[PDB]
Amino acid sequence: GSSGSSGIMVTKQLEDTTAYCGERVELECEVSEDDANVKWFKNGEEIIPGPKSRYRIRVEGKKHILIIEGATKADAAEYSVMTTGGQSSAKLSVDLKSGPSSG
């Protein structure tokens, strides 16, 4: 049943994501272990979610989902994850919706 290398390996590597300003960004990924606890880092910095945070790390089976509430020109950064035995990186580019936002 559950027989895999000691550490954890990122089966599915993050993929470049292009969202708009204020939009909601969602980074999905998969690992070797289940209900694991990956570490999401923004441009090398360690993210710290919570009841009063912007980033919300969700765990679903053997896949993680890093959602970002309000993706501004600042949110657009290289998001890299770190596990017990794996690491990944992605590029998030934020675009400012063109045209008058009406109707």
From Swiss-Prot:
What disulfide bonds does the UniProt entry report for this chain? none
Tell me where in this chain the Ig-like C2-type domain is found: 8-97
Q: Which residues carry this modification: Phosphothreonine?
A: T72
The record describes the protein's role as: Thick filament-associated protein located in the crossbridge region of vertebrate striated muscle a bands. Slow skeletal protein that binds to both myosin and actin. In vitro, binds to native thin filaments and modifies the activity of actin-activated myosin ATPase. May modulate muscle contraction or may play a more structural role.
Q: Which protein family is named in the record?
A: Belongs to the immunoglobulin superfamily. MyBP family.
Give the linked disease. Answer: Arthrogryposis, distal, 1B: A form of distal arthrogryposis, a disease characterized by congenital joint contractures that mainly involve two or more distal parts of the limbs, in the absence of a primary neurological or muscle disease. Distal arthrogryposis type 1 is characterized largely by camptodactyly and clubfoot. Hypoplasia and/or absence of some interphalangeal creases is common. The shoulders and hips are less frequently affected.
Indicate the quaternary assembly.
Interacts with USP25 (isoform USP25m only); the interaction prevents proteasomal degradation of MYBPC1.
Please identify the protein, giving its name as recorded.
Myosin-binding protein C, slow-type
Q: What is the lineage of its organism?
A: Eukaryota, Metazoa, Chordata, Craniata, Vertebrata
